[PDB]
Design a protein around this ligand. Structure first.
Ligand SMILES: N[C@@H](CC1=CCCCc2onc(O)c21)C(=O)O
Ligand SMILES: N[C@@H](CC1=CCCCc2onc(O)c21)C(=O)O
Ligand SMILES: [Cl-]
Ligand SMILES: [Cl-]
Lengths: 254, 253
């Protein structure tokens, strides 16, 4: 049978292809995750239909504890796999079976070049420069649930004033950084994509944590380990590396 | 219920404690992997006995397809867990169940400072400088099975003259790097440890690949997913980073 793969739009993992006519099915999309999905299907030998997550969300719980986003699609068995920049977190790993990481990364800071800010501590210990993250993503959740004093403070600043320091998505966060005196807490992978294309911005400090993106499957899924094994094979052959270079490719900056 | 944990001595993951009196049981060991094991037993609430792997090996296949080392202990159900610098690889993941990486790393180069050598390619195209890796480890295997031009060539060199360029273990590799004109391809985490303690040695280039160390368990183990979830919690709390900083920090160079 055909596997239903839930995903979400986000450059450069999943994007609408460009054509002079209307596109249909899997052909509507392209990006790192589509190349990954293609490699996985060739190795494990399965057909698949890509379907954008209806509510456009990654995955979190409501006050009742019920899930949404791609996580929910897997939990309800409306999707067999979730292929996207979906962070392997403690809370999510409890409700679905993640494959092993096909990409390793961490949270970092997106800000302007030629500045004296050099770390999260610098941001936390002042108030003139605003900073935040994408609402309901694994980055905001990191700050929300953190116990490390520096990060507890930064959270206080983020959730204050009805969370006005937070943005709805990466595109909005990036524009806010570009237009105002705002710093964006975002995953290193996405920051790298930006900095390579926009020399006016840079990453501040290093990674404040370590985590990975993994293919999601429903708990008990028989595809989880098979996918984990294909991912390890792809990494060992250098394919994951080639795929990353193919999609992050930019002129670079001085 | 006391779990049996197979491991292997390797600084600073698993080391004998220093005492003037004989040590017994788990008290004989100390290191990053033992602190991790303690954190894990505390979250999951299990008891455990640390036992060094009999043949002193990590885990590889021979031509008959038979496994040895820690991997074999798990396959044979002689250990409930494998906690050590055991690399999560394609061939091993097919015979045992790895938890999720509690440490991420990659293969890099250990060599002395002050030379023109800047990458693996610099080594592969030349022949005067010798280079190799610890025999039968995941690093050597990477080169042995690689189909990438540069690495294929480096393997051709490594396996030359009856593998004279390979060493039996990390300690031997380090001494060879310190004494002769030799470079040791070895996982970055170990290189970092060495360079913190040998101001004359350094890492050449970056990581040529990406992989992690995972807690090993027999296929179908009920503890694998539980360990995974505990590890993720440890990393999100910053405890894994603290543990690394604790055992890696040298004295200054
Ligand atoms: N990967 C995050 C969401 C996310 C996606 C894309 C851009 C990078 C990023 O930075 N913070 C996030 O929440 C994100 C998640 O799994 O919630
Ligand atoms: N982790 C490797 C073995 C290993 C152990 C310790 C030192 C670092 C290293 O570099 N190459 C290896 O094979 C090693 C493995 O699991 O085979
Ligand atoms: Cl639910
Ligand atoms: Cl896993």
């Amino acid at each position: 049978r055909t596997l239903i793969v839930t995903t979400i739009l986000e450059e450069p993992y999943v994007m609408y292809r460009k054509s002079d006519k209307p596109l249909y099915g899997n052909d509507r999309f392209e990006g790192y995750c589509l190349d990954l999905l293609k490699e996985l299907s060739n190795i494990l030998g399965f057909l698949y239909d890509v379907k954008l997550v209806p509510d456009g969300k990654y995955g979190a719980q409501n006050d009742k504890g019920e899930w949404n986003g791609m996580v929910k699609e897997l939990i309800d068995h409306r999707a067999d796999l979730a292929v996207a920049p979906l962070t392997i977190t403690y809370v999510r790993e409890k409700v679905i079976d993640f494959s092993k990481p096909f990409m390793t990364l961490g949270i970092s800071i997106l800000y302007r070049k030629g500045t004296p800010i050099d770390s999260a501590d610098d941001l936390a210990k002042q108030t003139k420069i605003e900073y935040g993250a994408v609402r309901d993503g694994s980055t905001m959740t990191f700050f929300k649930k953190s116990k490390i004093s520096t990060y507890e403070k930064m959270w206080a600043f983020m959730s204050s004033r009805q969370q006005s320091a937070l943005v709805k998505n990466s595109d909005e966060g990036i524009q806010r950084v570009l237009t105002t005196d705002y710093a964006l807490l975002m995953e290193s992978t996405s920051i790298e994509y930006v900095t390579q294309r926009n020399c006016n911005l840079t990453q501040i400090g290093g990674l404040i944590d370590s985590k990975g993106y993994g293919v999601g499957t429903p708990i008990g899924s028989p595809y989880r380990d098979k996918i984990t094994i294909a991912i390890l094979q792809l990494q060992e052959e250098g394919k994951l590396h080639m795929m990353k270079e193919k999609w992050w490719r930019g002129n670079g900056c001085p």
